[PDB]
Design a protein around this ligand. Structure first.
Ligand SMILES: [Cl-]
Length: 162
C-alpha cells in the first residue's frame, strides 16, 4: 500500500463532475473544483485545469493527472509549512502518508489548526493523538474516513486499509 492507493480508496474516482460530502463541485479523485454553487463556474474551472473544453467530463488519464498533481502539491505544501514540516519529519513512512491524506482533504491551513494533535504526534503519544483527532468536526462529519486515517496514526500500519 502507498499514498496513492490509500487516497484512491478514500476518495474514489468519478469522471463526471459531482458534489463532495460538503456539496462542493469536484471531479476525478477528489479534486475540488470550486466552492461556488455554480455549475458553470465549476465547468469553467474544470476546462482551465484540463486545458480543453470538457463539458464536465474527463478521461481516466486526465483524472490521474490531476491526482498526481494534487498529491505532489500536498507533499510540497507540508514541506513548506513551518508547523507541518517538523511533524512530518519526525514521523515514520506510514504515518507520513496519514498526514498527507489529511492535508489533501483539508488543506494545509486546515491541518495546521490541529495544534494539539500535531504536538502529540510529534511526541509519539499515539493513543492520545488518536483521541484528540477524534474531537473534531472532521471526525463527526466523515467518521469512516476519519477513523481510517486515525487508525493509521495510532498503529503505524495499513490495517485500516486492508
Ligand atoms: Cl467518511
Amino acid at each position: 500500500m502507498n499514498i496513492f492507493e490509500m487516497l484512491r480508496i478514500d476518495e474514489g474516482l468519478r469522471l463526471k463532475i459531482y458534489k463532495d460530502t460538503e456539496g462542493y463541485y469536484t471531479i476525478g479523485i477528489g479534486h475540488l473544483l470550486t466552492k461556488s454553487p455554480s455549475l458553470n463556474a465549476a465547468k469553467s474551472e474544470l476546462d482551465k485545469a484540463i486545458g480543453r473544453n470538457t463539458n464536465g467530463v474527463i478521461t481516466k488519464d486526465e483524472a490521474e493527472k490531476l491526482f498526481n498533481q494534487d498529491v505532489d502539491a500536498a507533499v510540497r505544501g507540508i514541506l513548506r509549512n513551518a508547523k507541518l514540516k517538523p511533524v512530518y519529519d519526525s514521523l515514520d513512512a506510514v504515518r507520513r502518508a496519514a498526514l498527507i491524506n489529511m492535508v489533501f482533504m483539508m488543506g494545509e491551513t486546515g491541518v495546521a489548526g490541529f495544534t494539539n494533535s500535531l504536538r502529540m504526534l510529534q511526541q509519539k503519544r499515539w493513543d492520545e493523538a488518536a483521541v484528540n483527532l477524534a474531537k473534531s468536526r472532521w471526525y463527526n462529519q466523515t467518521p469512516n474516513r476519519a477513523k481510517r486515517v486515525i487508525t493509521t496514526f495510532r498503529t503505524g500500519t495499513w490495517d485500516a486499509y486492508k
